[PDB]
Design a protein around this motif. Structure first.
Motif: not given
Lengths: 120, 120
Positions: A1-9, A33, A36, A39-40, A120, B2-4, B6, B8
């Motif tokens: 499976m293709e699965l990704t999670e992107d962090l932006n803070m 911070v 996360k 976690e990433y 991740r 601000e934390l997101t 995402d 996919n």
């Protein structure tokens, strides 16, 4: 499976006039911070410090960077985050976000903004 | 602050000829989607079903939508995912991913592809 999670803070820390200490009210945000960044594990941060426009150019070059370094130091020293994942730069008064003519505009400009990105 | 984060995720499920049941093979992957749908309660899924080009055209229109609906039903019924988070649509044999002249290509075209996106 293709699965990704992107962090932006984005972290914003504000400082009193001529000060580069992290006020206690900002500790919960730094702790988040750090959580996360664990976690990433590939995530990195770009920490940018700033001054209002008052005082010598030389003071503000140093003060802007000292404020970014204070954020980095809290992460490195208190949360055991590897230093090389965190960049720091100071912009002195070159990047205002508010009106330097008002006490409250000056308070807004005395800040560090950190952008954390990872996947991740 | 601000934390997101995402999400996919891309799910691929394949079907036997003239069938729209979920083969036990796919159940772990469907379980994983449901897990992320719970970890990202705002995420939605775009579920699209397809057929190979054998057989009457209306049989394939129905079967393609039935495939997409079988994946949705597994999420709604076994994993209690809110049905309104999940869209389904069938494309009959109009969007092949492989050669319908071979058994292997036809087996690739008998599919549901779902894209699951959202932030928390």
């Amino acid at each position: 499976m293709e699965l990704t999670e992107d962090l932006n803070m984005e972290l914003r820390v504000f400082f009193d006039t001529n000060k580069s200490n992290i006020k206690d009210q900002y500790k919960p945000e730094i702790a988040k911070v750090a959580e996360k960044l664990s976690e990433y594990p590939n995530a990195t941060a770009r920490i940018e410090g700033h001054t209002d426009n008052t005082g010598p150019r030389k003071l503000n070059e140093r003060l802007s960077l000292a404020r970014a370094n204070s954020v980095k130091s809290a992460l490195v020293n208190e949360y055991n985050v590897d230093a090389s994942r965190l960049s720091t730069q100071g912009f002195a008064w070159d990047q205002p976000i508010a009106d330097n003519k008002t006490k409250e505009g000056r308070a807004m400009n005395r800040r560090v903004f950190a952008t954390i990105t990872g996947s991740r």
